[PDB]
């Protein structure tokens, strides 16, 4: 089927440059009208740039002269090369296919987060939330930037899992909790491990939670 796989997001300094890639499957980028769309945290959708099937390119006024949209036909990949990045450029960036006639966006990439900040990367401290229906979790504390991914038992336990939105502490670092409810009749036999992955700092922590 049709697929759009995005990479390139992460932390970069203000004034810095960063390239995003969007690898297509099931169709050609060269013969299609293609687009980048961004969404600032908690905000609406903003159109960034387009590239026509015939190669013509157009840019939002806010990115003109800083950003370049392009494609590599043989790699079947769409690119956005960004420059002179500011905090206003912090957003989830989406690549999208759209038909030339009406510019509706029928296929979207999964998105990739770009965080424009001068603050240093820090890995999270993972502490257990022990039970004493039983609730148990992991406290993912003091990290920068977003995001962290939390699974339970390598993704085998998904039922009853709540991973909370991160809160910005007064220190400038993020913290969240991930909890799961389980039958207390299984606390003796079943092992519960939270897998906290923070790719910006290469931090990959497995933490066993016990009674």
């Amino acid at each position: 089927e049709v697929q759009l796989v995005e990479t390139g997001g992460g932390l970069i300094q203000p004034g810095g440059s960063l390239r995003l890639s969007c690898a297509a499957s099931g169709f050609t980028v060269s013969s299609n009208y293609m687009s980048w769309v961004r969404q600032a945290p908690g905000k609406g959708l903003e159109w960034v740039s387009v590239i026509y099937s015939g190669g013509s390119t157009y840019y939002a006024d806010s990115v003109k002269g800083r950003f370049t949209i392009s494609r590599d036909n043989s790699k079947n990949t769409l690119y956005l090369q960004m420059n002179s990045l500011r905090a206003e450029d912090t957003a989830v960036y989406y690549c999208a296919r759209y038909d030339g006639i009406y510019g509706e966006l029928d296929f979207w990439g999964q998105g990739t987060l770009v965080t424009v900040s001068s603050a240093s990367t820090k890995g999270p401290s993972v502490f257990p939330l022990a039970p004493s229906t039983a609730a148990l979790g992991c406290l993912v504390k003091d990290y920068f930037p977003e995001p962290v991914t939390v699974s339970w038992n390598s993704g085998a336990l998904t039922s009853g899992v709540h991973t909370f939105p991160a809160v910005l502490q007064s220190s400038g670092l993020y913290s969240l909790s991930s909890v799961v409810t389980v039958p207390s009749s299984s606390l003796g036999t079943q092992t519960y491990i939270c897998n906290v992955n923070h790719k910006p700092s290469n931090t990959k922590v497995d933490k066993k939670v016990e009674p």
Binding site: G103, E104, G109, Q110, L129, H162, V179
Partner: protein
Amino acid sequence: EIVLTQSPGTLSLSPGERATLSCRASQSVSSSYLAWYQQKPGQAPRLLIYGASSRATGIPDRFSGSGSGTDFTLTISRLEPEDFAVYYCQQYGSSPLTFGQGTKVEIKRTVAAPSVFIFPPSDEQLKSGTASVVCLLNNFYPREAKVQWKVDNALQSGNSQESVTEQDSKDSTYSLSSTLTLSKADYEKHKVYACEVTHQGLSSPVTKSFNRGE
């Protein structure tokens, strides 16, 4: 530039109810050049309607669109719990491509009281010299809840932070975590740590607590 104004900004309706969303354009937009998107949390927007009234691929019958000129409508004929999302209108009849500000749709389920759990800071965290006490309010509705912290009967202020999950796509409930943060020196010089919860689902506030040395 064509400005798209969506109304209402927020909408809360029960499952089975009809939902009607509006998108007003500052200039005339040809009917064939208006689209609607559904965006669920942590996901890309998904095309729902294109050309004012045509359904996209894999889109259920309950979604429909209509309108022309400057007034366009998205309708969900019968709301389902999975319809929790933000909905955006979009035009490309004129450059540049513009989006509406979005309509956040909440599913108005029946009152559900929270299950309250309290967590003492682990031993490992104490090594760093900081103590986080976590109060969990699990699977409740509506979103509004009051969480008060009490340390040896002393009502705390300005030393806790709250986080709420996005509305669940199946049971339409929320979960809330409250984290009380104190220094290890302050934590080990107190005994009773309580989390009081006031919520519509509860006839009276519920207090969960623990003793540090118990």
